[PDB]
């Protein structure tokens, strides 16, 4: 019940499906690659989750370190203020509860250090865990800071916005046929070194056995200097005449109603503000190829300055066209 498989959906996104793949694995370096690029919703969570985790973990470590040295006994049980004089043997001055260890870990890692919970020189394990906690805190801090700067570097690029018309046409220009779509642009910055390429996708057997299933020929776009470049501010019409060398040369008015054609168009180039290459692609199955229809004039010189009227981006009007073939039209004068 499904329609013929399309090579490229209207929103680019070549929908091929590679199977029989020699699946390597992950290498555990994939996680960091994913982490550097997340939607901002998450990178205000993994920040909080990392900081809060590390804090709590080192808090429990301080709790056990103090607990096993007998400090908590000396604080809790012995006299509160007067009946007891500290033996100075304590490991971490004035941390007599878990919450105290939390308010010590925060101090020891966010570099606050209020100074009501000092580090004495008795318990060597305490100094060891202090070195370890400080090192871990710095490593996490640098990684998170670099992640935040990376996700502030990519605030310029948003999305490829280059708009091709819905359905193409085929008309008459200078006594010869053609085939036209309509490219366009939206945002402020122009394109730089823009290029256009037209490929026709077909299943073309050969007289020598080979039958390439999905094979893609390239066809030229009309231009008086044979250069595939284009400089666009208002929408252009990148025509591509048909001739004996061209593959569409055997197309027909009625056969196109049931035919296997696939004219993908790709457009490449950079943008001045971003300074990043980019490209956009689309395809035109036979069902959305009209005939005789030509595109409409869109630019009208108003009183002050030129105006491009997007109101009729893809509107088409019928005009004279012959129902014969390209080879019929070019076969003979009388033809």
């Amino acid at each position: 019940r499904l329609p013929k498989a399309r090579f490229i959906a209207k929103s680019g996104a070549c929908n091929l499906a590679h199977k029989n793949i020699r699946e390597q694995g992950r290498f555990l370096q994939d996680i960091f690659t994913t982490l550097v690029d997340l939607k901002w919703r998450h990178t205000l969570v993994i920040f909080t989750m990392s900081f809060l985790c590390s804090w709590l973990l080192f808090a429990i470590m301080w709790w056990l370190v103090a607990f096993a040295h007998g400090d908590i006994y000396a604080y809790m049980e012995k006299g509160i203020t007067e009946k007891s004089g500290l033996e100075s043997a304590v490991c971490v001055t004035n941390v007599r509860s878990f919450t105290s260890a939390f308010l010590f870990s925060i101090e020891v890692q966010v570099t606050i250090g209020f100074g009501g919970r000092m580090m004495t020189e008795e318990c060597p394990l305490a100094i060891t865990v202090l070195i370890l906690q400080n090192i871990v805190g710095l490593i996490i801090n640098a990684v998170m800071l670099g992640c935040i700067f990376m996700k502030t570097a990519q605030a310029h690029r948003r999305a490829e916005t280059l708009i091709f018309s819905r359905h193409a046409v085929i008309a008459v220009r200078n006594g010869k046929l053609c085939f036209m779509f309509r490219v366009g642009d939206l945002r402020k910055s122009m394109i730089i070194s823009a290029s256009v390429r037209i490929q026709v996708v077909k299943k073309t057997t050969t007289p020598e056995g080979e039958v390439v299933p999905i094979h893609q020929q390239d066809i030229p776009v009309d231009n008086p200097i044979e250069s595939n470049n284009i400089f666009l501010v208002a929408p252009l019409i990148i025509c591509h005449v048909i001739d004996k060398r061209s593959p569409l040369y055997d197309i027909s008015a009625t056969d196109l109603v049931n035919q296997d054609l696939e004219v993908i168009v790709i457009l490449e180039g950079v943008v001045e503000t971003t300074g990043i290459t980019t490209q956009a692609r689309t395809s035109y199955i036979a069902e959305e190829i009209q005939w005789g229809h030509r595109f409409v004039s869109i630019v009208t010189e108003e009183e002050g300055v030129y105006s491009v009227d997007y109101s009729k981006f893809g509107n088409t009007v019928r005009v004279a066209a012959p129902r014969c073939s390209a080879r019929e039209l070019d076969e003979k004068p009388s033809i």
Partner: peptide
Amino acid sequence: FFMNPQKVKPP
């Protein structure tokens, strides 16, 4: 020191 052989599994 393991073969670490890779075989894909069918749907």
